[PDB]
Amino acid sequence: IIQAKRDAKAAGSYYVEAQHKLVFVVRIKGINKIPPKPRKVLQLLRLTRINSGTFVKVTKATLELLKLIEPYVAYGYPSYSTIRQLVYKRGFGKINKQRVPLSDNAIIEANLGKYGILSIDDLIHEIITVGPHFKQANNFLWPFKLSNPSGGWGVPRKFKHFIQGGSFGNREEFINKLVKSMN
């Protein structure tokens, strides 16, 4: 990617990077006073608690869900470091409807082995590169329960759009800093 940008600039063109295939969405609003459609979309994205986060593969169908729940979530494009730290520290699998910590590769192999995922790094790879079995890997991952940000939200008020000096909506690359401070 870096060399493609450099070569396009050298040739006098502009390298338009591929649109992001993955987002991380964190619910930043409480559970009270949510209209039914955004509340249902949050439930279907498994953000049923404030400071809970999930990975979403970007399509039109999920982009419209993000559009619906924008005033209640902060979402963006997670880096490899962010995904790795999330899975390593707060990674839990849904096994027999139970939240089991991913403390060993045997758990991941026993639950995602049929999809070719043998380890926690296989899981991280399937998340970052949206693979054929991204849906199964993401659903196996329990919704991440993050704390409040350690340095604060960086804004006086969370519940206006990130573009308007708030916290919600697409903060595309700054979601990494937010999630890292929240992790």
Partner: protein
């Protein structure tokens, strides 16, 4: 007092699609409806017989009965907290074949053909539709397309 007749509030619903009044064209009567066919309900105001109630305007259902000049349509109506089966006897002027499944049937035939050609040529099917994906990387040239710089315009009235 209040007024809730059979055709109450149908003043614009049951109008005749301005400059499309008069006799119903013959394709409406030459249409053939079989049991199980999916039909959309749109009342023709010029045909007062066999007319659907205003609730069923724009509703899509399944034919369960075929009579001389009418079909029976099954509609699931939301009543309270559940759906009730309703059976309407509608003349063919108030219904048309639904295209809500023509795309599905054509996809079925195309999927069958693709599966056969796959099991003849190699191993690849990909028979599921996918949502619009994020765009891949592309290189945009400036040859004959040098970027033009725009600025916000000052205020003026021009009234």
């Amino acid at each position: 007092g209040k007024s809730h007749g059979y055709r109450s509030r149908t003043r614009y619903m049951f109008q005749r699609d301005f400059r499309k009044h008069g006799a119903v064209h013959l394709s409406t009567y030459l249409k053939v409806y079989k049991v199980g066919d999916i039909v959309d309900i749109k009342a023709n105001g010029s045909i007062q017989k066999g007319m659907p109630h205003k609730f069923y305007q724009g509703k899509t259902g399944v034919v369960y009965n075929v009579t001389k000049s009418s079909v029976g349509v099954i509609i699931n109506k939301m009543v309270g907290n559940r759906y009730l089966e309703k059976r309407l006897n509608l003349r063919v002027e108030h219904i048309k074949h639904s295209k809500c499944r023509q795309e599905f049937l054509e996809r079925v035939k195309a999927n069958a053909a693709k599966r056969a050609e796959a099991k003849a040529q190699g191993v690849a099917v990909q028979l599921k539709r996918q949502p619009a994906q994020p765009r891949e990387s592309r290189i945009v040239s400036t040859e004959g397309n040098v970027p033009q710089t725009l600025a916000p315009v000052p205020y003026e009235t021009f009234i």
